[PDB]
Design a protein around this ligand. Structure first.
Ligand code: HEM
Ligand code: HEM
Lengths: 106, 106
């Protein structure tokens, strides 16, 4: 999928997690988030189209997804273990990663 | 996929990395490893079929995959950044995670 589709998937599923009741709902949403972030990892955003794949900006951009995917994975681990509230807390904190990349590159 | 299929994917792609020449080869192999490890995360192995999903053994088993996925992810980052030799060194070291789980549960 393209960047915008992956980002909508990320956003929709974050909302699902916030209001989820059980571990199955949270696990599913984070699983979809992991796939969407992985798909987006390789993408070149509009604001960086004129930059080289090896530019400081693109290294920074890809590093943001590496951070995000690690956070999603750790949240998913908690969901796997039935730790609903704590996974929801992890999902809340990773918004900082969403925000930080948007700040620079959206 | 079942455990055996995911493990074959894990094994075959590790061999690919070992003898890879460029970053594209390593990135592709690690991407496939990530998917296979994620798919195997929820699996109940033959030796643990009589155990509860909340048993100490299944907690230990799932934790091994959490570790492996994080290691694959970190290697994949290196591969994405064109760091071939260093990604290959990362793939070498995670064999310890493969071996440790097999030691107990294979
Ligand atoms: C789970 C965390 C994140 C959420 C919930 C999120 C959400 C969104 C949303 C709702 C949009 C609006 C565009 C659309 O989807 O139609 C967007 C755009 C964008 N996001 Fe994210 N985002 C997240 C993380 C990230 C990260 C980590 C990066 C970079 C490493 C990133 C880079 C971008 C860029 C460059 C755009 C603008 C795309 C365009 O204008 O075509 N996002 N994001
Ligand atoms: C990159 C690391 C790994 C590699 C290369 C690897 C490789 C393999 C291979 C080749 C097999 C034999 C499959 C077959 O042909 O029947 C196997 C089996 C198995 N592995 Fe792994 N493995 C890895 C990681 C892990 C981890 C981390 C765990 C535990 C958390 C694990 C648990 C098992 C189990 C339970 C079996 C037996 C499956 C069955 O009998 O159905 N493996 N592995």
């Amino acid at each position: 999928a393209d960047l915008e589709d992956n980002m909508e998937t990320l956003n929709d599923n974050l909302k699902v997690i916030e209001k989820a009741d059980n571990a199955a709902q949270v696990k599913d949403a984070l699983t979809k988030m992991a796939a969407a972030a992985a798909d987006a990892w390789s993408a070149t955003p509009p604001k960086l189209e004129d930059k080289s794949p090896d530019s400081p900006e693109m290294h920074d951009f890809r590093h943001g997804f590496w951070i995000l995917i690690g956070q999603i994975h750790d949240a998913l681990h908690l969901a796997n273990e039935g730790k609903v509230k704590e996974a929801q807390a992890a999902a809340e904190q990773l918004k900082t990663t969403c925000n930080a990349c948007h700040q620079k590159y959206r």
